[model samples]
Target: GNLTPLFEELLQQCPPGGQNKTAHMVSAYQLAQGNWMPTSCHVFMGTISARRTKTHPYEAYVKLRELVEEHKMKTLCPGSSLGKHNEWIIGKIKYQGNLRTKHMLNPGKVAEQLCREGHRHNVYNKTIGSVMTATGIRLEKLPVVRAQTDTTNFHQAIRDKIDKEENLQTPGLHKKLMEVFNALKRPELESSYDAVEWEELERGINRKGAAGFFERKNIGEILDSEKNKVEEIIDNLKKGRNIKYYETAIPKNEKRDVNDDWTAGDFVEEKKPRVIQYPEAKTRLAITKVMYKWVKQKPVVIPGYEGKTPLFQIFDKVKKEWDQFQNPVAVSFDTKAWDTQVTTKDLELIKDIQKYYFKKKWHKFIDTLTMHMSEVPVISADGEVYIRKGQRGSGQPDTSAGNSMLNVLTMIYAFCEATGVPYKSFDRVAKIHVCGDDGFLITERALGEKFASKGVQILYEAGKPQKITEGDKMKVAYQFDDIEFCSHTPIQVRWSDNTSSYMPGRNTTTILAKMATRLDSSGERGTIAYEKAVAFSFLLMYSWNPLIRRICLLVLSTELQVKPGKSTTYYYEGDPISAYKEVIGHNLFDLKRTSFEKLAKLNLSMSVLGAWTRHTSKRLLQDCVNVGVKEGNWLVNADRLVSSKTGNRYIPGEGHTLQGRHYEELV
Candidate 1:
């Protein structure tokens, strides 16, 4: 073996997904990429396998390439830890039940609930991240039993049927095997669950246990019972629920503004921007840097220098800059960064204003300045204020998105006003709209609106929300909401809020938006100003799930406006403590197409799912085997042993620990 820290150092030092590059390249300082720890097997949505591609550094890359392709005539793969592939397992979850009712009741709703329940079961019970690969999720393809061969003898056929739907995520699949054991517990309910009771059930009651243990397990009994003590427990169960092996995708490159999301149509029919934050973390303040981006030196009117020009051109460009800066950020105040000026004194004054601006407030303004952040509603710790910094649910923004950014923005605003936080910076300057990262849509001093400029909100960040839509809308924003975290349950926010879109009802601007837009730089403060509030409602409610405390997966769409672009995303507040703690681990863009396809075909059985998955794995294995068997070598399957990839291929007459290691040594 080569004596070098070269491989070790490279492997240890290489950051996955250009993460180090994004971090280290910023002004030669860490930036876009945060201090992200890597997943052992983060699934790359675009790659061939379910496992995310491990990024390689220069030395390791060369070594891997050489070891795989350079050597000849070996029984085992030269550098592989395993013979050919890594540790692998076949996991399945399927069930067979009375799915043969002439017709399914509440088909749409039932299917939706079943999928959700299944996702929850897998995420929580199975202790898996519910990952999928570029190969797509494969389902068992049971032999097609045509209606022509309909023997209809369930006694004989049921076992066969049970064998077919092999969903490993189904914790109670054994219970479904009652037909096999010939012992089925009967729930007394002949009627389907009613809305009220269903809501209670959705909260937290158990089927086999006592909240209603002695009581008849009838739908009406469960629903009609005013005593929803059982319901309370059910909610507790939902509090930290997980959806194991649920198939969802994240993106390979998830930088804000750098990568576009691929949401063509979905709820709110809106697309999300890939939420990669500003890169080049180190700050650089310069004069004339804005005028000549990328040029650091202040240009002198040297005629031979083509870039700098005469006074008239400079005057015109400056005037344009002045006008842009002058646009009312809030309260009809001009927020132009360089309004009506060519003087260094005013420039120096601008610097003074910067000093007074609260760093937190400035950061908040920049952070929330984007259309995406603007849609993600935020609730104050007290729950009295609903603020939408933008949509930041999934750790990264949606890549490959072609849908309207505004629509997504509006969804958050609507959620806040409709359900939780109704407070918005209505007195905000519209010009600040240019800086989503700062959250300052416009400056109070420059544009003449207000923030903590005097600690008196020119317009309070929290007050009666300026509505962007119609009058008489219910205020959904709840201030002072408390949130907590749980160790056990896989927290997910699943809420159903069906409210009308809160966009400007018509063509004209209202007092709130008009005044705010004119005064503020963000574009709207009057009725138009209210548009921001309307867009933020959903994301606001989504921000905090006090009751559950789980990170939420928000789903939204009205009857008329549902589209593929309106997809939901999963998000948690902080970075995962480790790769295994909690994660959003798949590259989503590769899976977005499949997401819609899978959603379209949601009513699939497990065996049907299994057959498909194995077929796919077999194909992959064939490739792995081919790669290993190019020469005439007796490849050992290392058949039937504990962690076959590890200690399975062992020498006889040795302890288990020494046996496998000795075999490798001999080879």
Candidate 2:
């Protein structure tokens, strides 16, 4: 047999001019020529140069944000208020794997998962849209929950997260997938899960995986549903047999069995015949969030506005007002006192401590200091890289220019408040402490007790300098009997003006050279071999792919510092990741943040479903276009981008390609 037919068929399927068989993922925006086939290769040398270094991820992040802001400023941004980022995070979670996967993967899995999740969300919205046409009633977008009773409902906020990540792109996929396989029905075999006896169920649920699980939530009045169905069938069969016995005209075959070709059917009276009662496997129910049955009998309708506009469902969690605590004055202590195990010896040391506490931000040491500066540049000290929207000092605070990290924290806080988190919950105070010539460990404990008596919950432990736990979370302000102290902007008080004591920033220019230091030790003879052995050189290190999010969280929490010299960050939650211990120490929030300038520059980042995915647009749009079948001419969320009247435009999240290293290498 010739293989020409198959090849021809495949060629026909992938037409010559079609994008499917195109060289690669080159966009028309990128020169519109032959498919982009430029293979990427790097030059290597025995003597490491700064040219090989990678720009920090956060630097790229800052730059990307600037790029977004630039779009907004140019009035070209979509109307959605940064909601798609939620889908990006969820995609990352799904990509990393679950129970069935056993967690092995190619690098592209994360990106694929992200895009698929987006498709799923697109489907959910389309489903809701279908309800509108068929029943002439539109379900509300996810509902929002407000902090107070008079405010937004708690359900609304949750609904919104669901809304943000709603499968508006693939609304019809939800409908179609349900059609082929009955979500409500699954293949089953007789087993303990289907057994009536409690003893059998105690052993396992069924032969299939869903056994002892699927617990009933209600109060116990246990009944086996499978047994009930079996009994009902058995009664029907018995009635059939009885009818056959009573009919005098009916004749039974003595030589032949009743289970013949012309066998009796259940409910037998000539037309009906006897049937033996036994369990039979049936398909399981379909998976769906819809409760159509409840609303079907009682008409369900959402009051639609005269305008047919696609809307978002923003959900907020419900909040109950707890008792607020009143905290007074900043707690102060000398780091020197803790280190030397002594204090009160020199007035000069006390003076030094007092002097350190007198900066403009010094008040922040004792109280919640929240200063908002919008135009601040997020720049590292060395300035090898800069990530800004426009040129520095161009009316917009130069984001690429060097600025303090304190502003980034404030910006996060601002986002929190704007997005609906209460300011009180976000309130917290931080103070920089330095060791003095005379103070010792004893004074540190004294400082802790002083704050504790004053109703302040210090986030740091006094004895071991342990981190703040959930128990340490307390309102910066506590009012008992109306004697209160509250400040609108908690002041930041710098304890010392000495730059020498502060952490110094290191330039990242030498990092690449240092990393390649191992290769250079062999007198440059094996350099070319090692560089060419790039894939094998990677075998030297085998570590789990870290969730970029954990790194983001670490930075946001101030638990890890990104210094230029060693920008690696550590994540801690009771116990640290076992393998990463060597890179960053366990305490999580030691005095390492000082001079951490690596997080401030360069701007690029990878989102899981972002541009890096293979067959991206087609695979992504597959779900988007699917809403076509179930939705039937209904405009989906993906369509919202095309419509100007409805304001819900599609805004793709930011992403960049990651340079992959070979797993087989030992460089």
Candidate 3:
């Protein structure tokens, strides 16, 4: 059908003269051929980048022509070509073999040859936008990057080490963890327990429960089974037959099943799916129910926001210690896959440590959770079933217990190392920050190396016995240096001008990049309502940090200018702040009271923020444009000066006015 509108929209963000060349070539070629071509193929042709000096419209046109011809030939070949008449069986098999070989060669040898020749023939914009418009492929959401070979190898190595040892029974680990656990300040657990109970109940009743290995029960079934499940759990606890939860492996990447009619691209070698484990819904509910009574008797408090502590409160505390030391050095350590790496032996050690702090019932509860966790049943996506070899499954409801155990263990490990190194004197200033599996040792600059070495040792002993890679290991940063820390936001400690301060880290770049991709994939006519809301939310989220807020403001302002349409009025079913407060429970005290006001005034502030943002953005755009035009920059001269407000760029010789020019081209 007609694709003039689609091409016009696509070329709006493209280089100058692309629209004219694309339209002229497609029209003339189709006219000469005396046949109408598929609109998607034309869109695909438009998506091919001509970055190479020798590869322009001509090369792309030739490639498209060849691909179409090959497709037509395949459709018209042999038995299929002769209106489904039977042909020689050997000929048919040979034809099929050749086609399979061709498909294999396309992605493999062709990609290798192109790489060897320093040639890039990949589609632009990740091919998401083009592929969606062309082939109607739904968006493919891949799993987290942790499924890569390096991380998988790291995971396997940890498992092997644990399997060989069969236990991580550190000699004095129980005693040390007990000491640390008791010394820590505890929060009232009743509130948190009640909150969790209410939340789980709402989830089960409202059918908001997450997916598990077994087919999820309906809300009615869930309610009907709740009483029976609780009774069964109690009976199991009485009989000492610990529940064995089943886990499942899900494919990380989307399955490729392209139709033969579509000539999009060949598939590359498929990566293995990541293994993930989840307990059945009944098991989850029963576990939560059992834990409630035990937690009330004796609380397990850890040094993380998972407890009554707020995330920002921890940051505040760290910042205080950071400022107290002269030329302080902060060494950060992150445990690689701590959840999956934690062994049953580690849990036993934690249980032994808690023997002093917990009542008999609490210890029994811990035992029940830990007993069958080691040899739990696991089902793969391919229907292969086996017992879990080692380590904890991520789906266990007692994840907080694991976190608490790790926090205490690491604390003890850090304390031992520090005392052994005789940096104990600096312990007054040298504060250890533990958030789940991530730890930061803030000590004097003189003791930085000693503490870092100890920190590395602690991570090695805790997670993997093998040497940790630099990427997965610790990072040491001194005065005037920036080091990433464990925080809700991507807050990193930047040391400058005799003071250390928190600032937004590299995550902002990813956010902006993802936003750009989302905007592109939505197509020209699609509304950016969700993106605009998220941008505003980010602005409010980081309003405490001026630099971060300013960055978000710049993005929001630019987006607002481009869309300029009225944002959809987003409504919540209940009192949003109250809902969050109920879920968050007592930890709400850690946040500023203004947080409530922030949520309350979200829509109002967006409009207010938008007004100032638009004004500032307009001036910024004008300034950039004036600078480019006055300086006679090559970008402006070449008609490639892009607008930050609009995705379009300037076309000097065209009838378009200079007012339409934008500033983004300078980059």
Candidate 4:
């Protein structure tokens, strides 16, 4: 209703007596309404009406003006529109027969209306800029003013004089000031020379790879254990005594060579396929290097096929079936020495699935997949190359693919036997979820103990022992309870009335504690440079809730303020971006220069602060929308903002189209 006079003024200002004059006027009016000219329905109507009569644009504008006036009269009646007048205008102007546009009101007009109604609107500057762009209007700078006002008042000058006199008279003031200064003083950073010692670096590296260095005897023992296990599996396969899921020989009609390429005779003399030991974690030796040249040289079929991994499919099935039980408990388990224990016999099971799924191309799929795991030549620190038989090497890319498939197959067989479900009936036992060697079984609370016990025994019988004593032990937790897993924070399944919901999990206390210790340890000398400070802040914000991320930013702000000139060289050894480049190779960070002079020339601090403020405001607005307007419950996690009631997940700067665009240029 407030836009009526503006539209009338625009109509009256239009020049008459020209071809397409009405079309131009209508286009201008739509542009003022905040509709892009090309998408305006008024232009479409004017074009259609032009074919029928010559005086279409003027007639159309007058008709639209009369319609608005009629609507204004109705708005005076109590509860006449009930906020439906806007809908009526949209339906008449923008609605195209059966099709309708969402919130089809002029953005500029809505912004003006919001301001007129005394609402907090963010689109005022954007509206003004858009109008100037459309109308070719230039804003003139005002003349500078010469008159100046006195900044200091008589009362302020008297107060300053009195304060100086009082300070001279008071001896305790200096003592109190000294105490305050001492309270704010920060500790000095540890000497970088000691921290960067070659011996200390070597110690850190060696401790990480202690299993392969200090405990070299254990490596030998496990290699022998794996050798024995592989030998037994091969013996059984040769005898054809335990074959159930895979085909032993290629079909007679198939024209393919059955070459057993991994013979000890060929490997012992060739000097090929030798494993090279490399440094891991800076100081520890890793024996993961195995030559994949043979696998790559050999021609294999189905190289470029795209298919979803079975691991993610299992996760989906688990998420879908999670809420079925009224009282559910999850028991998670992982397999030890998964990659080392996978023999050629284990790969045969994957062949069975390929045969069922691939059908026509099954042979090529199996051959291409198995060649990567056929044999491994491992070299000891003593320079002797030992032939590792039957086991799949951990260095191969196919190791994950073969291991995940084997894990799923083994778990399926074990789960069927444990639950007494039929072997092939996968849908009947969909309570288990597996990712590589790690997996969890969801069951009713009462059956948790029984299922875990029986499942462990079944897995052992199937030659896949659950890692109970060593790594991550199997644990059980009920719904609405949190449980810890190996190498992961914590997971919980919360119960909401009748539905069970899952939340993204993170340990807030653990993160905060680590951050606090890091800040205290770094002290003044170890302070990060401005570029690295902003980069590190961004890294910390990822996957963290807005609340915790804000705290981390504030901590970083405090550290920067305390030690403004100190560089991050003590920790990074060079520019942080260069150090990152050493790890990931040339990337986006490498394209930009990191010098303070270059940064200052670009006014980097102000721009960065503005960008951060813009981003933070959007996230805060989304939080308010989710809580106050959507009536949704905010679940706490580092990465995702989810509402319990609406199941609407909030990503920063999403959902609000106009608001997102407004903030995009606000900074």
The local distance difference test score of each candidate is 0.20, 0.19, 0.39, 0.32
Model 1 lDDT at residue 253: 23
Task: Rank the candidate models, highest TM-score first.
Answer: 3, 4, 1, 2
Tell me the lDDT of model 1 at 543. 22
Cα miss at 36, model 4 (Å)?
A: 89
Residue 452 lDDT in candidate 3 = 53
lDDT of 1 by residue, 229-255 (tens): 443432332343211101111111211
Residues 470-492 of candidate 3: C-alpha lDDT, one tens digit per residue? 53234676642255554342343
Q: Could you arrange the candidates by lDDT from highest to lowest?
A: 3, 4, 1, 2
Deviation of model 2 at 168, angstroms: 52
lDDT of 2 by residue, 124-156 (tens): 222212322232221221111111111122112
Cα RMSDs of all predictions? 34.5, 37.7, 25.1, 38.2
TM-score (all chains, Cα) for each model = 0.15, 0.14, 0.50, 0.33
Q: What lDDT tens digits, residue by residue, belong to model 4 across residues 1-667?
A: 3343344343322211222345334433343343222211221211111122343344545554564455446544321111221232222222122111121112111111111111111111222222222222222110111111111221122122211100011112223222322322222311110112233222312121223211333333434344444334333433433211110100011111111121112211111111222211111111111111111211112111111221112222344555687677777666655554554456554444333333242244344334422332222222122223344544343444445556655555555445565544534434654445655666666555555655543444344545553312246656422332322322222222333222233333222222322212233323344333432323222222333333322333232233222222222232332332332223211122122332232222223222133344355434333442343322211122223323553222111101101011110
lDDT of 1 at 375: 23
Collision pairs in model 3: none
Error of 2 at 274 (Å): 54
- The 10-residue segment of model 3 with minimum total lDDT is 658-667
